[PDB]
Amino acid sequence: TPDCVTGKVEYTKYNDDDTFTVKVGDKELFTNRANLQSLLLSAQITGMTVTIKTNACHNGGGFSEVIFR
Amino acid sequence: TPDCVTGKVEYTKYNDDDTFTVKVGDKELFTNRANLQSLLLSAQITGMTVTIKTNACHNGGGFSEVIFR
Amino acid sequence: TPDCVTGKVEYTKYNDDDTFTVKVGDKELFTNRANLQSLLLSAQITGMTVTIKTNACHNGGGFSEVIFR
Amino acid sequence: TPDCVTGKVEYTKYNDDDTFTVKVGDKELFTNRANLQSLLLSAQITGMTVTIKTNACHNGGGFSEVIFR
Amino acid sequence: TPDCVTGKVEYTKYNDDDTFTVKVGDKELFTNRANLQSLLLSAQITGMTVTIKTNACHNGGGFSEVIFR
Lengths: 69, 69, 69, 69, 69
Fold this sequence. Notes:
Distance between the termini of chain A: 18 Å
Function (chains A, B, C, D, E): The B subunit is responsible for the binding of the holotoxin to specific receptors on the target cell surface, such as globotriaosylceramide (Gb3) in human intestinal microvilli.
Oligomer: homopentamer
CATH class of chain A: Mainly Beta
Subcellular location (chains A, B, C, D, E): Secreted
Family (chains A, B, C, D, E): Belongs to the stxB family.
Structural class of chain A: mainly beta
GO molecular function (chains A, B, C, D, E): toxin activity
Largest interface: D-E, 15 and 16 residues
Helix content of chain A: 10-25%
Strand content of chain A: 35-45%
CATH architecture of chain A: Beta Barrel
Number of helices of chain A: 1
PDB class: toxin
Shape of chain A: globular
């Protein structure tokens, strides 16, 4: 799966349908994997660099692969 | 969903019916989404700014959308 | 539900029947709500003030309402 | 249940059968309670003193009661 | 099970099939044990030394035993 965006997490958002949105760089992407919620919030809290990999690389696109650095 | 309140978490409360109350600004709101409990406690512990979005924007109102900054 | 005790957590204890004991002030109380286990350990780790509300306000009393400050 | 060992956690180990081993003092003990895994890792990360209570107080013994201080 | 690699976690990766990859030393290994995801991310965040034990000691090998130091 191609890299879509790499950077620090600007904000995260818990959505009404229980998906989780993350803003990295200039993209706002969402995931429906519940396990990723606290992992992404910890990446945000500790200033990690995340690389989100997704084919839906556009605002509102979904993802399920993340590298935490 | 309209923004209801933005600020640092003043306190959180685990309720008898397993819902979770959060006080931000001047509003005391609650959520019944279990996944939000440790996310909101981490936001409190690390001094994050949260924006709670809800139509029930009054004390005792329920919510399910939160932005963590 | 009346306030029972307010203070910093002195210690927590995982019990054999999977309940969780917390000592605050001079009271040793327990809860059977699994969700409260890591929330109370985080309150302990970060020096939060907790207020336990319970009618069973005596050693060995059970509780399910907590304010984290 | 008698106290078996008190001290800081020297290391923890995730085992193939999903049990979790902890070394405190001179004893290597294990637990099969999934809830204790992240609680014990947090106790290790923050230098807490833990008291493991168990009748099987010997290397390889199992436990389910822990005091976190 | 033989030791495969010991060192600090260079990065972790959440995979599309919900397995979790970790890079330690020169090996990239994965686990399918969901419980290990946040334990390994905490080990990464706090600079722990981990020893991964596995017979599949090669890139892309799977593991289920980890010592956290």
